[PDB]
Amino acid sequence: MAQASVVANQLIPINTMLTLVMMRSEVVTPVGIPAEDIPRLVSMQVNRAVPLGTTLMPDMVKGYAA
């Protein structure tokens, strides 16, 4: 892609509220939540465990729509 996505900088356990240390920006495929959205994702909860290096997708965050 040349669009960058949000990917997990650490294992994010199920039902954790996202913080900034947990999210990095990388050009990965398939593309996930756009990297520009990282500030809007803080304090939202993920609904599954996200391992280190996994791309964050719209369906993994509770309450996300964009």
From Swiss-Prot:
GO terms for cellular component: extracellular region. InterPro entries: AFP_Neu5c_C, AFP_Neu5c_C_sf, Antifreeze_III. The record marks 10, 15, 19, 45 as: Important for ice-binding. Detected in blood serum (at protein level). It is found in: Secreted. Gene3D superfamilies: Antifreeze-like/N-acetylneuraminic acid synthase C-terminal domain. Belongs to the type-III AFP family. This is Type-3 ice-structuring protein HPLC 12.
